[PDB]
Amino acid sequence: GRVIRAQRKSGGIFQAHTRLRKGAAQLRTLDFAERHGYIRGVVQKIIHDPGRGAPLAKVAFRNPYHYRTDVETFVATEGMYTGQFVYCGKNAALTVGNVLPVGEMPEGTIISNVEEKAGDRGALGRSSGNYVIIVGHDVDTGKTRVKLPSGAKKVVPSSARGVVGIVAGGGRIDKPLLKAGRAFHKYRVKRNCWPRTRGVAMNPVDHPHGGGNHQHVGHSTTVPRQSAPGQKVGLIAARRTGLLRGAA
Template sequence: MLAGTASIARLLGRSCGSVSSISRPRIIAAAKCPTVYQRPVACCSYATIAKSEEPLPITFESPFAKPPDRSEEMVRMRTYKPRTPGVRHLRRPVNDHLWKGRPYLPLTIPRKGHGLGGRNNSGRITVRHRGGGHKRRIRTVDFSRWDPGQHIVDRVEYDPGRSAHIALITSQQTGKKSYILAADGLREGDKVQSYRSGVPEDLLASMGGVIDPGMLAAKTAWRGNCLPLRYIPIGAVIHALGTIVNGPAKFCRAAGTYATVVAKDEIRGFAVVRLQSGEVRRFMIDAHATVGVVSNPTWRHRQLGKAGRSRWLGIRPTVRGVAMNACDHPHGGGRGKSKGNRHPVSPWGIPTKSGYKTRRVGKKNPWVVTERPRGKEKKDRL
């Protein structure tokens, strides 16, 4: 006991007194001495904001709504000192504006059941490499946005079920709360509005009784507002597009995605929109869309840093076919890494890669004007 007491006294320093005169309560009190154990907060910080050489997406000059100012040529990511192997390559987006607390519980439901492991209603695995992960609650996001009037953004939150961020908004007329997809640059205290149910009478009267998209843009438009494609000027940057008049948003809902209005044909009743993949597509002119770019655009630059972080997300390991036995995969067996001069196939023998086409001939989508570039055409475009 005396040897242990002496070692504690040496750690605490000679200022705490001799070993013979120190009792157990005095040693505990000395351990709480701020001059010995407490350090400045600045010394504990081991995260820094690094900048990548890869440029950000091109900003669009739109009379309706501009994406946030990204004039800097670098991508801001948070890196960490390599105190452990798991944080050596960890890179995370800088999102200091996100809400730090729990979600709004009335708009969430627990995510439970065997469906977490990629299984169908009979219990069979239909999607491989899924299972486990951290406990989650599903956020109920409003993709329709029928409620009119102004809404105040209470906060912007992280959503574990999607790559984009979500915003909790409150209606000024009814006080009803709802979750929407957050546009890039949307912050707490901003006001958003939906004109899907119609333009208010006072705003319509200020435009002379006729809705002019350009005048409507000058008066009210800002990121996060939802309105029909009929009222959106050509060249506007939008996201969360609906396909039919009364349906919810289907397109451009992932982090950093957007679309551009190319043309409108009010006589035939559709608008032509260019998607981010390069596909040019028709939409009903009364289908709705939201102004701006989807939030969290630097999500694609993240690096998880370790395998355990992937397991937290519910992603299980993926084993290569050449590493399996011949009875488990067509590429398995043999000595070394050979796959037997066979073209890449799935575990069930279906060809993969190499441009294997699975679309039915003669059943083209009538809404697609120009298909997205594929193969050599896509490489030439890049």
């Protein structure tokens, strides 16, 4: 046969389009000021990052060791404004836009850009309108239980930092794209993944679903998890199929 499109997406023309992107959205390097006290920064810009629904925030801090200022690229939280003072550290106040360790915050708080490990500069809850809820704590072997946007429950060390509030950008998926042009423009600044040709519309050489006098798969679309590349197409390791008629 032939190498399928999924196998062909290893790079090259399938890389992300990052010319217009302004920078990574890392929180900050976990330093002495954030570990022991707090540090004050000023939000000097709130800008639009192409390919990302949520806005980005350029925040200027003061270097504690050298005569210099450092500009960060926080993920903008809803309600943040330019000229606002944000505080990052263990002793920061429970205010929207501040970055605090998860272990220094009560139960039920809504946060964003949460670290999986203390120092990775934000991993969880970064897309627009998404947030992470702090479910509980455990002082002995200090670890915090949190609820992720997908409903999963994750345990993190009680030193990971998170931003109080919700990622700015509100509900973006509520508006229909309404035409291929909007879909074309949406994915143009993201990558070469649009449009998509159905496998049953191809030939047997191209896709496992191609061929036949009628457009049909001919075999179960649910494929095993331990499937070789080139045949891991369709529904991979599907626990169940059909309409989700009641789920939690």
